Amino acid sequence: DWEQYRDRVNMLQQERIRDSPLLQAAKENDLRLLKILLLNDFQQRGAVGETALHVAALYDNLEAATLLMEAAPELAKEPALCEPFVGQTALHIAVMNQNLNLVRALLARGASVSARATGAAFRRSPHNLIYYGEHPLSFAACVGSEEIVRLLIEHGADIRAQDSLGNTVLHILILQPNKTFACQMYNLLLSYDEQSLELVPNHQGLTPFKLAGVEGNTVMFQHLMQKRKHVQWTCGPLTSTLYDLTEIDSWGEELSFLELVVSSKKREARQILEQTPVKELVSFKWKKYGRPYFCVLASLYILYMICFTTCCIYRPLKLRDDNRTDPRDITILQQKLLQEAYVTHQDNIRLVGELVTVTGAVIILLLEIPDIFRVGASRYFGQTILGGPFHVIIITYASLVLLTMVMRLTNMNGEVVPLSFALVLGWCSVMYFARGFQMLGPFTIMIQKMIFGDLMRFCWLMAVVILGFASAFHITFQTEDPNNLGEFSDYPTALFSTFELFLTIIDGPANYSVDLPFMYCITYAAFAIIATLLMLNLFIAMMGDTHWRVAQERDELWRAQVVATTVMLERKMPRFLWPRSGICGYEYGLGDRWFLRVENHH
Amino acid sequence: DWEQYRDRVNMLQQERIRDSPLLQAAKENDLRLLKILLLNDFQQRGAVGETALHVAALYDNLEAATLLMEAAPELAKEPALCEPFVGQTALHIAVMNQNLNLVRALLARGASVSARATGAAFRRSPHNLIYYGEHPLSFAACVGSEEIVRLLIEHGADIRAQDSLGNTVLHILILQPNKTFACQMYNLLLSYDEQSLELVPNHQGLTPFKLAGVEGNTVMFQHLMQKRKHVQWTCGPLTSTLYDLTEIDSWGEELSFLELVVSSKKREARQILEQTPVKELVSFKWKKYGRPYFCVLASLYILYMICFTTCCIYRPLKLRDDNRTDPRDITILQQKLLQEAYVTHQDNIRLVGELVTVTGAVIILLLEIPDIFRVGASRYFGQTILGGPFHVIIITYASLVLLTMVMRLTNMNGEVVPLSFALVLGWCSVMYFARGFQMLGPFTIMIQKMIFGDLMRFCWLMAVVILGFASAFHITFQTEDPNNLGEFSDYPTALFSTFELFLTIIDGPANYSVDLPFMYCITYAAFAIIATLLMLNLFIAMMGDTHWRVAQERDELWRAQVVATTVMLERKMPRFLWPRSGICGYEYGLGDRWFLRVENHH
Ligand SMILES: CC(C)[C@@H](C)/C=C/[C@@H](C)[C@H]1CC[C@H]2C3=CC=C4C[C@@H](O)CC[C@]4(C)[C@H]3CC[C@]12C
Ligand SMILES: CC(C)[C@@H](C)/C=C/[C@@H](C)[C@H]1CC[C@H]2C3=CC=C4C[C@@H](O)CC[C@]4(C)[C@H]3CC[C@]12C
Ligand SMILES: CC(C)[C@@H](C)/C=C/[C@@H](C)[C@H]1CC[C@H]2C3=CC=C4C[C@@H](O)CC[C@]4(C)[C@H]3CC[C@]12C
Ligand SMILES: CC(C)[C@@H](C)/C=C/[C@@H](C)[C@H]1CC[C@H]2C3=CC=C4C[C@@H](O)CC[C@]4(C)[C@H]3CC[C@]12C
């Protein structure tokens, strides 16, 4: 809807301009028409509450604008009035258009340096092609005009002014597309900070440094670190550099810089983890504490999955309580009742295995469920870097184990169902620990990108081929004796047999002792060419093409998963297992700060 | 044939020139021979009716040509006479050769600016390496000569002159290979238009704008739009531009610009759909109306295919009316007659499912058959972008359902045959709707390019291996008892078993309880190495290589299929479901035209 509305607003602005000789003269730069018309209403408006001076500024007409102020100087103070552009002044427009002389002329008339363009055209949104904040200084910074940024601070513009998101100009600058002035402009604006402006948080709680991390602005991140590094010594090709970890390690805060970076929705935030002080810090944390503890947690989880598997294998079963009648029934055994199920030393050993099994399902829920709420369910389940799909299946596993325990307590039949799903998802969730090892981590990401990519696309077109051919095979065999060829004997079996025949995992139905219907040979030749020969090998060809084009994305995602594991372990484990990282400054007279020392060759 | 004929014409032209001292002097530029020979027939002809002045112009000899006119000025007016070059003048030739002084000399003698070179050498065809139209002005435009184009219009050449295709010079220019003058030359020729010349249609009904769309000339399309855009405002990096949709949306016309573009045979016409106003218009139409309605039509078609499938599953069958005799017969059931087939509430429910099934087959034919005639059967079935092969199978489906209904009404046996083909093609045609979704559309094009590409090439060489080895296996087993190994028991079964063994979809024939002929082990080892190991994996290797080299073509074809779906839906659906797209100019005083407003960052 918003596009058609904005489109109408734009048409309606031009309609009023074209309808009004003052606004047309201001757009056209018709000095002669202004020199007639201004002598005989100056406060008349375009469709959004824009004045003739907004029009003159928009069409970049200094000559018209100086006439309009000479006739009616109060126009320099006027905001626009309607929701798209409300609060916008001719000063915001003169800054957008980089017209230094028109800006200085509006300031000479006393246009407000602190006016907020609060309308919907100025809010960070997918609707807007730019986000310059709401103040003339924020615009002057985002257009890169050093002259206008100085001229506005000379006229009393406040560098610490915040917009409707709480963004100061330093936050607005870090949100810009990477262009050469943006770091120059940040370094200029901090020269007027003489708490510091770069410590002011927005309404998300982000300081400009954390915003650079979340937004993936690696150029601004390196610029921010030039003032947090100290070059300790240089000797020949070697230098020792000491980096202040205060902002990076984010000590004692609920949401850390590293957590905000790994949990960011933006693709570019992974590149912050490859920036020098960050890369060495998370590397140290991983090789020192993270990998050792993750290998222990993997071992404990594998041992727990062996315990659960043993409790499935030794599950309590007795010879069935009724006779089998029809030859098609093969069930011979049956679930024991509670007071039959715990009557031997072997059951008492299985019972402690069941209690360990249930205890671990509770511990999974106690560890997982609080992090759904903190992170938000969309990010907690939806992020490859955090382990999103492994969170879905490990909670499903714990839910199915607790379902199995309430079924057991109730003497409820069919425990084999939740136990089978629990064994599959229980064991498949061991692949969460693949992320700890360079052999297996990148490959586990590649399997994930194949499942949510080429597998769903293949399975939709495969389902349509299966519905076609299974129906053809079923009705081809409906005339025939099902005991002579069973694969297509009823429609559910025909679907299942056709699915197995698509994958070639059962042999092509054959009985050379009998005359099969001629339409089967035809239909199977068409199915063998389309499903088996073409489609299944085209799935190989498709994944082969996807693999080489995904290979770098897979490796970046793996380096990000190691960091997200490191961050998660340190936040969740007891603090005595995670000593504070880097060098304590207090031992060396550097005050309360902590450092990373990096030595490098150049 | 035409090459050998033209070749003879060219040899015969040179033969006459070499035979005739006047024409040889005109080619050679032998001024001294002309200064002897011209004093004592000047109207004598080369093999195609060319004069000595045509020869002098062709060999680019101004000196000879001014002598020939000094002796016989009527030569400037002479056309060539024979079918290859009929109507060609020395003025057409002097323009081809860009000889401004020779052109101005022929015009001083009163050579016709409006002569038509109507012969076969000048017609748009695959025989001709250039198409410059038929008039000297059309040639002057296509050689890019601004001096000669001005000099010809100064001498009264008509810019609106049309050739045998109805092409004006603006159409001829849009047909040229993209070279720097072609837009300059179009912009020059419109400066003499002061209805407009760019509204004149050719004999296909195409104006120059629609011809640029059909021909895929994206450079001329962008040039044409520079005069249909209005830049509404510019502010900082943003601009709002208003594009006139009149030619693009082609409102109320039988064949629209967008339909002519998507239905074009030329590969380059897809690139027009990625040009700014077109791209935003078809995108709006798709996201606003096309995708919603296509998802409904997909749902209704899937529900219809479920209804038909249910009518196949519940088809009316009774226990056979005769005893089975030989053990090889497995048929136990049989088709019911009409007065047996509709006798229960379950049959009455199936009957309304059959009536819905038949009604939908009629509705498919009522929707499809008129579009065969309008589009032409070669384009309607032959285009990947329009859905050509899906039109073939969906009409085959409807034909087989109506065949099945006339069989049913006749009590005709073997309904299983058209029903099986109808189930396969009925369900496979659901993949037509894959084009609506980015997950499935590109992949459905890739399956199509594999079927008509690497699959036919593999299936021809596979058939030759199957004929070889099936014959070897059959005659190897002819000596042996068919009840001990059935796969090769007769030649049709040997072919079918060999085809299934090629694909590995049945197991290698084995019976370890008996002595198989030694020639079987040899022949199967050769078949396993050639068919299974080599050829079938070479099919995987081949499609893998085809896939990466086709991947971009596949994605362009998908973006074109979304537009062709959008265009088709809007033309076929009721108009109240497709409100006219863009902005009505009449609300804003812009007259009867409709616009797209585009906002962009630069
Ligand atoms: C029990 C059966 C009947 C069915 C219901 C179970 C589904 C299993 C096989 C499927 C469901 C989702 C799948 C799945 C989800 C996502 C990932 C993350 C990826 O990086 C590695 C593979 C992995 C871990 C796979 C493993 C197989 C799973 C767990
Ligand atoms: C990869 C995609 C295509 C997935 C969705 C495919 C699913 C189809 C082919 C498979 C998946 C589960 C299969 C399935 C589940 C269980 C049963 C019960 C069995 O006694 C009869 C067959 C029946 C009913 C089959 C029918 C075919 C199904 C539904
Ligand atoms: C019923 C059997 C015996 C035989 C005769 C039928 C043939 C089927 C299997 C074949 C014939 C042509 C094939 C075909 C034609 C072209 C296309 C377009 C492509 O983009 C997707 C696949 C698709 C839709 C395939 C699907 C499988 C089809 C429909
Ligand atoms: C992919 C290409 C090679 C295609 C054309 C291959 C076709 C051959 C191998 C297959 C397609 C259909 C098959 C086929 C159709 C139906 C029957 C009836 C059956 O009772 C005996 C075998 C017989 C006669 C087989 C013989 C082998 C055929 C003709």
Author numbering:
A (entry chain B), B (entry chain A): 28 to 67, 71 to 224, 230 to 637
Paper text:
Next, we prepared cryo-EM grids of wild-type rabbit TRPV5 reconstituted into nanodiscs treated first with 400 μM PI(4,5)P2 for 5–10 min and then 1 mM RR for 45 min before preparing grids. This dataset yielded a single stable state: TRPV5PIP2+RR with C4 symmetry at 2.65 Å resolution. TRPV5PIP2+RR contained strong extra density at the TRPV5 SF consistent with the size and shape of RR, but did not show the expected density for PI(4,5)P2. The RR molecule in TRPV5PIP2+RR remains coordinated at Site 2, with the Thr539 backbone carbonyl and sidechain hydroxyl forming hydrogen bonds (3.1–3.2 Å) with ammonia groups of the top ruthenium atom. The bottom of the RR molecule now occupies Site 3, which allows for the formation of hydrogen bonds with Asn572 (2.9 Å). TRPV5PIP2+RR also has density coordinated at Asp542 which is significantly separated from the RR density and is likely caused by the coordination of an ion at this position. Conversely, the addition of RR to PI(4,5)P2-activated TRPV5 caused the channel to close and take on a conformation identical to TRPV5Apo. No density in the TRPV5PIP2+RR map was observed for the PI(4,5)P2 molecule, likely because the channel is closed. Based on our data, we propose that RR interaction with Asn572 at Site 3 may pull the S6 helix towards the central axis of the pore and closes the lower gate at Ile575. This closure would draw the key Arg584 residue away from the PI(4,5)P2 binding site, leading to the observed loss of PI(4,5)P2 binding.
